[PDB]
Write a protein that binds this ligand. Structure first.
Ligand SMILES: O=c1[nH]c2sccc2c2cc(OCc3ccccc3)ccc12
Lengths: 194, 197
């Protein structure tokens, strides 16, 4: 379990509210304010989910072997409604749970501004919006299309050797879709208002 | 990786043909023939998939920690069409690819207690050469309840704690004959049985 996690008194799940003005809070706030400087941040929480982390780190080590090194990880955004936050904190992102034009997977945005749309980060009865900062194993990617249930093969002659993720645009991606459970770790939860 | 496996010389995947007369072949043949005595086995292959094994064993250790000294794993059957065998061997069981079962207890991957269920042509579709295909699968059934057709995840154990889930669902808790799982890496395809009429 990572150094920068704080002690969990022998528990396997906790949400840790970050201290404003310290290096970690500042780093996550800056990633958000790059595109959402007009929004008000109420708090940022570190998600310490030992089991999700374990499963994710196994998939990362596999993808690092499969892709023969390569930086396979990106930090992306995911807006969610308040009613889904408890499920995501405990279980992560589930493709079985908006437009799915690039495939039937879980969608992650490059820009917080995209995830900040009310269609994704639905304001709750108090006006509070929720967005995750997510470690995503995007790996080697290709353009997606409607109706994919997995990424396409890297070569149709070997139909089981797949891309890791798909995107809207390979040259200048703004969203990524992953189709498997172990490929996204929700690292921080931002609670904010318009 | 398990010490019983063949040396794969740094490779991540192999199918190993078992020999009749070995305990390993004979136990699977007996488990199959208990309910499929009218069919004949062509061959039994051990599936050695390092990455699927690693991810499955992590989920088993997690369920063993979470559950109270429960036997979380059952050895179950899953009938497949020939076209799906290469994908399952490499990538396991994807709920997003699953057919609607004739009796639905949820939108997940189905596994049978009895080989006779998986041996139905609806599940183990005979290929162009009359070969039928069935996996023998380690499944993390964990703590289970009777399923229902609307489910896309297992139900909560307690309605006032919606995130604390059953591990799987079944058709009948007192006499389970099928299990449904809703997550990746909850089922490891261990053997492939090729068989004919
Ligand atoms: O942050 C997100 N949260 C959620 S919750 C349910 C969906 C999303 C989501 C979807 C996103 O792309 C969708 C799309 C598809 C085709 C063309 C343009 C856009 C992008 C981001 C999100």
């Amino acid at each position: 379990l990572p150094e920068h996690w704080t002690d969990m008194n022998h528990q396997l799940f906790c949400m840790v509210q970050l201290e404003p003005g310290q290096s970690e809070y500042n780093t996550i706030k800056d990633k958000f304010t790059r595109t959402c400087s007009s929004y008000a941040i109420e708090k940022i929480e570190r998600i310490q989910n030992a089991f999700l982390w374990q499963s994710y780190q196994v998939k990362k080590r596999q993808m690092d072997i499969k892709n023969d090194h390569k930086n396979n990880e990106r930090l992306l955004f995911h807006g969610t409604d308040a009613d889904s936050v408890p499920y995501v904190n405990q279980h992560g992102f589930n493709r079985s749970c908006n437009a799915v034009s690039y495939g039937k997977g879980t969608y992650f945005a490059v820009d917080a501004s995209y995830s900040a749309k009310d269609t994704y980060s639905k304001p709750d009865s108090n006006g509070r919006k929720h967005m995750y900062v997510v470690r995503v194993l995007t790996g080697v990617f290709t353009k997606g299309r409607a109706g994919l249930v997995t990424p396409p093969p890297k070569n149709p002659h070997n139909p089981t050797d797949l891309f890791d993720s798909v995107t809207n645009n390979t040259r200048s991606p703004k969203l990524f879709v992953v189709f498997f459970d172990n490929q996204a770790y929700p690292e921080y939860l931002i609670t904010f208002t318009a």
